[PDB]
Design an enzyme around this catalytic site. Structure first.
Site, mmCIF file in Angstrom:
data_model
loop_
_atom_site.group_PDB
_atom_site.id
_atom_site.type_symbol
_atom_site.label_atom_id
_atom_site.label_comp_id
_atom_site.label_asym_id
_atom_site.label_seq_id
_atom_site.Cartn_x
_atom_site.Cartn_y
_atom_site.Cartn_z
ATOM 1 C CG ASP A 1 -1.934 -1.070 1.205
ATOM 2 O OD1 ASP A 1 -2.961 -0.810 0.548
ATOM 3 O OD2 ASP A 1 -1.763 -2.150 1.799
ATOM 4 C CG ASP B 1 -4.958 -1.824 8.269
ATOM 5 O OD1 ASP B 1 -5.013 -1.371 7.103
ATOM 6 O OD2 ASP B 1 -5.517 -1.270 9.241
ATOM 7 C CG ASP C 1 -6.831 -5.014 3.375
ATOM 8 O OD1 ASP C 1 -7.324 -4.969 2.227
ATOM 9 O OD2 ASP C 1 -6.539 -3.985 4.023
#
Ligand code: TG1
Length: 994
Positions: free
Chosen positions: A351, A703, A707
């Protein structure tokens, strides 16, 4: 009820036939409950029982070694001998190791945390409903709630199921859906229906999710789904339905176990097959069963000779030692085996925010309109120094400092940034630095208002504790913020109605200060503010604004731009009904463009470097962002993921785009993709799935329950330090500091632990290559039995078990990261190495038996024993080589054995050295490099004498302190193993297979 969010509270109440006022009748409840079931995630199993044990003893190698005990117990029971201290040894040393590696196996006091367990920790226990049986707000068990019944939630409450808000009683309702995504900023809810049949949780503004807790307010709604039929339950099933494959190493140790278990019995056939003489001569005497024990005493010896019972101890040691070694670098590895796979990692999906970046927003540039005319309008651009949250910086125009307030527009500019902000800045006394309070963005906006200071408000003679929000407040005093229209992904903007405070003199009625994504907001501006005056918004102008917004967002200085505008003549306070979310857009039209501001979230100072490292390592890194495709791509060129000028037309997709791609085209896109922007929810799982349809060891960052599926799925999931417990319990590795760089570090680390593991693994089993060979010669040609079964054990748990562990510290070979990722389908032993470890294994089989064969015949023991015939007769029924005497008692005495074993333990110490490299000789690889290796070699022989001198030991081992005269032979019989080695090891030059 599936798409309850797209229905009206009515259509929705009707679907179940319930009175918002009465509730669910007792019948409906039992009736409904029979149809949907209990509002609970299905339960799991796994506790103290007979299972764990039996499965423990289900493995092959642990069985072949248990069978040897189910025979040694009886074999060492019929054996003739006045000793009762050496008989119950074998059937115990094994039965001990078996039970030993069964406790440290059924050890679930640590590793026992399942990801689906925490999932049940998010669902509450009690909830309040409104049935028709009682006019009171009965607070029944959550587990008994049902689709259809109307429930009540108020602050602090944990939402019991997925409900469709019906009526909000409080001023406003705010829930904390962080549990799902992570951005702990609570959100406003409404009652208006989200018509799009397929909205995403984030956009379902009129729904509460089970697991979510209410921040502010109190509301009543009708439950839509319970149990697995819920956002939380759905995520649960995906995880339940995913099963991770066994790691590559663990996959080899099984392949081995199988091909082995066959070869073991394959040799038990050669025995009963080579016996072509024993079929005739052997007559009376009762040796039918008394002589058949020989076929059993060889199994419980041939077996224990090819089973490195010390491996499942060394690999675990080297591994547990790596866990800590990586923990020092901030990478917490939950699953042990993982340290192996983390090395075969070929793709890293990370990310952007707070991993690839710092999450330290700060406004760098901003501009307003200078002059508009003849379709050719100019602008005024400024820059701002200061990348911290501290109101410590200057605003400069043309590289030189200017007074933000000498500029009419820059005023209103700053005005909007303060009254259209739901945040503040705080100087933390204790710590000693200003910190953000809420959205990291809006804070950067607040900090700008300070640095700017359009009203010159005195700030030099102020305290860091009360100066942080000085200028902002000043502006809150010239305008009374009544109500505010929250942000929404549909209008990508967010206003805030303001009123002219009585203590003023410039009150143009009411105002509306809007701020959002450039495109949308700008498209709703009918005017442009040129200083103080206003003028019609014209193409050329809009053309110019969009122009500079496009440069800052894709340029070399990746910026996130926000358009700032305002409504001069806002609709009447009466004509506005705040409860109507989707209606906000209109209330925000007929605007006046004022200015733009571009801020930056700096990529982390160490990431630029690691991305490169992953290049040399042949690891593909995929950045997953929230930025718009355009800026994603820039940040990507910026952090190195893409060349400064590479073609990326087909390597980066937005979520929408990736969705308009049919399966074939989607998969086909994951094998080249390096950047995903505004990716949809599922996509993470999708992508992982695709990357795998290419046998790629994929690392996934994330997180939040959101996810969890993908973290489970991905080969190596990576939760963040600040992440949810579930996201952590689902990942294989947790980033202590949620930093990208530490993923690459850990990859390299775990990439060295195998390179070393691969050694002590092809060493500790390379000796087993001999032990069997030995046992075959020591059984085929005569019975000069040199290696006792209950003797090999100590040679596999310490004798060679020590240099193995010592091998778990070999110096990391350079260029470790300048080679492509390993292959999960790469056998440790094969090719030239197969033949290599072949000889060195048979040669040690000619060395061991030889210490008892080459001995008798050239030794200082047996003047007329040379060229004996231990092959012809062994039972000794008569006398041919020696008439009347006492020589038929040599077939069982510490003489030929205590010599072989010593040689064995001598050839291994030289083989451990042959296990430091695979090409470079010990001349280029000084056997004294691995300091911890020698430190073990010595402690290896230091215990070889301890079972040769201290009586309590040398006896039970069937050995005796060899004279330094006869012990001088252990050299020229063992020492030359290194030559054959060095030969085959120096012959890897012509054979460019290494
Ligand atoms: C444990 C002790 C012994 C001695 C054993 O028989 O191991 C075999 C065996 C099971 C394999 C072989 C050994 O093969 C033989 O001994 C065959 C008979 C030779 C007769 C020649 C007469 C002149 C390994 C040991 O040896 C060499 C020296 O090449 C390498 C390797 O092992 C590994 O890579 C396992 C690591 C996890 C395996 O081919 C392996 O089979 C597999 O499936 C693997 C992939 O496991």
């Amino acid at each position: 009820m599936e798409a309850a969010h797209s229905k009206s509270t009515e259509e929705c109440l009707a679907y179940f036939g319930v009175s918002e006022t009465t509730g669910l009748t007792p019948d409906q409840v039992k009736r409904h409950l029979e149809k949907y079931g209990h509002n609970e995630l299905p339960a799991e199993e796994g506790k103290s029982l007979w299972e764990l044990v039996i499965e423990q003893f289900e493995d092959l190698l642990v069985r072949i070694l248990l069978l040897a005990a189910c025979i040694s117990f009886v074999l060492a029971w019929f054996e003739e001998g006045e000793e009762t201290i050496t008989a119950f040894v074998e059937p115990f040393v094994i039965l001990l190791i078996l039970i030993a590696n069964a406790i440290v196996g059924v050890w679930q006091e640590r590793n026992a945390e399942n990801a689906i367990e925490a999932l049940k920790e998010y669902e509450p226990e009690m909830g309040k409903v409104y049935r028709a049986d009682r006019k009171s707000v009965q607070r029944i068990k959550a587990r008994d709630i049902v689709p259809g019944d109307i429930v009540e939630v108020a602050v602090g409450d944990k939402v019991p199921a997925d409900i469709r808000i019906l009526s909000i009683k409080s001023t406003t309702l705010r829930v904390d859906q962080s549990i799902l995504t992570g951005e702990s900023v609570s959100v406003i809810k409404h009652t208006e229906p989200v018509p799009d049949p397929r909205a995403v949780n984030q956009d379902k503004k009129n729904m509460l999710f089970s697991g979510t807790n209410i921040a502010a307010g109190k509301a009543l709604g009708i439950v839509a789904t319970t149990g697995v039929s819920t956002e939380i339950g759905k995520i649960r099933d995906q995880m339940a339905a995913t099963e991770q494959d066994k790691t590559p190493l663990q996959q080899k140790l099984d392949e081995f176990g199988e091909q082995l278990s066959k070869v073991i019995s394959l040799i038990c056939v050669a025995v009963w097959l080579i016996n072509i003489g024993h079929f005739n001569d052997p007559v009376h005497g009762g040796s039918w069963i008394r002589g058949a024990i020989y076929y059993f005493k060889i199994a419980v010896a041939l077996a224990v000779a090819a089973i490195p019972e010390g491996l499942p101890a060394v690999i675990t040691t080297c591994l547990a030692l790596g866990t800590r070694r990586m923990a020092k670098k901030n990478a917490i590895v939950r699953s042990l085996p993982s340290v192996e796979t983390l090395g075969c990692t070929s793709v890293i999906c990370s990310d952007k925010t707070g991993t690839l970046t710092t999450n330290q927003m700060s406004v760098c540039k901003m501009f307003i309109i200078d002059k508009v005319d003849g379709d050719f309008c100019s602008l005024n651009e400024f820059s701002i120094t200061g990348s911290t949250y501290a109101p410590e910086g200057e605003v400069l125009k043309n590289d030189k400092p200017i007074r933000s307030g000498q500029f009419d527009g820059l005023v209103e500019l700053a005005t909007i940034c303060a009254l259209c902000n739901d945040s503040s800045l705080d100087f933390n006394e204790t710590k000693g630095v200003y910190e953000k309070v809420g959205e990291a963005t809006e804070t950067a906006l607040t900090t700008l208002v300070e640095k700017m200071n359009v009203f010159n408000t005195e700030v030099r003679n102020l305290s860091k504790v009360e100066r942080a929000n000085a200028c902002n407040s000043v502006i809150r005093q010239l305008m009374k913020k009544e109500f505010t229209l929250e942000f929404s992904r549909d209008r990508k903007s967010m206003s805030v109605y303001c009123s002219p405070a009585k203590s003023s003199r410039a009150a143009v009625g009411n105002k509306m200060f809007v701020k959002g994504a450039p495109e949308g907001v700008i498209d709703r501006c009918n005017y442009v503010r040129v200083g103080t005056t206003r003028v019609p918004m014209t193409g050329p102008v809009k053309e110019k604004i969009l122009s500079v917004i496009k440069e800052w967002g894709t340029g070399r200085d990746t910026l996130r731009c926000l358009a700032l505008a305002t409504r001069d003549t806002p609709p009447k306070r009466e004509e506005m009904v705040l409860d109507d979310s989707s209606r906000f857009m209109e209330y925000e039209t007929d605007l006046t463009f004022v200015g733009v501001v571009g801020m930056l979230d700096p990529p982390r100072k160490e990431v630029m470097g690691s991305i490169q490292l992953c290049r040399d390592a042949g690891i593909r890194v995929i950045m997953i962002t929230g930025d718009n495709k355009g800026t994603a791509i820039a940040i990507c060129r910026r952090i190195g993921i893409f060349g400064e000028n590479e073609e990326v037309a087909d390597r980066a997709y937005t979520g929408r785009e990736f969705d308009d791609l049919p399966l074939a085209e989607q998969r086909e896109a994951c094998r080249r993709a390096c950047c995903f922007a505004r990716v949809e929810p599922s996509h993470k799982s999708k992508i992982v799935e695709y990357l795998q349809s290419y046998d790629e060891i994929t690392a996934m960052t994330g997180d939040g329950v959101n996810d969890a599926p993908a973290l489970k799925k991905a080969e190596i999931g990576i939760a963040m330090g600040s992440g949810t417990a579930v996201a952590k319990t689902a990942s294989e590795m947790v980033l202590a500091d949620d930093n990208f760089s530490t993923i690459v570090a850990a990859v390299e680390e775990g990439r060295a632990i195998y390179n070393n593991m691969k050694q002590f693994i092809r060493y500790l089993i390379s000796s087993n290559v001999g032990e069997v060979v030995c046992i075959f010669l020591t059984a085929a040609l005569g019975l000069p039995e040199a290696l006792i079964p209950v003797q090999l054990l100590w040679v596999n748990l310490v004798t060679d078990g020590l240099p193995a562990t010592a091998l778990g510290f070999n110096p990391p070979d350079l260029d470790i990261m300048d080679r492509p990722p390993r292959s999960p389908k790469e056998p440790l032993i094969s090719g030239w190495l197969f033949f290599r470890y072949m000889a060195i294994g048979g040669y040690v089989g000619a060395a061991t038996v030889g210490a008892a064969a080459w001995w008798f015949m050239y030794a200082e023991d047996g003047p007329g024993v040379t060229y004996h015939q231990l092959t012809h007769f062994m039972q000794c029924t008569e006398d041919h080589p020696h008439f009347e005497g006492l020589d038929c008692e040599i077939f069982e005495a510490p003489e030929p054995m205590t010599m072989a074993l010593s040689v064995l333990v001598t050839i291994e110490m030289c083989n451990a050295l042959n296990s430091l490299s695979e090409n470079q000789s010990l001349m280029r690889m000084p056997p004294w490099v691995n300091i911890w290796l020698l430190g073990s070699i010595c402690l290896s022989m230091s215990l070889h004498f301890l079972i040769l001198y201290v009586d309590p030991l040398p006896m039970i081992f069937k050995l005796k302190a060899l004279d330094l005269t006869q012990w001088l032979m252990v050299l020229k019989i063992s020492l030359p193993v290194i030559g054959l080695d060095e030969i085959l090891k120096f012959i890897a030059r012509n054979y460019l297979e290494g």
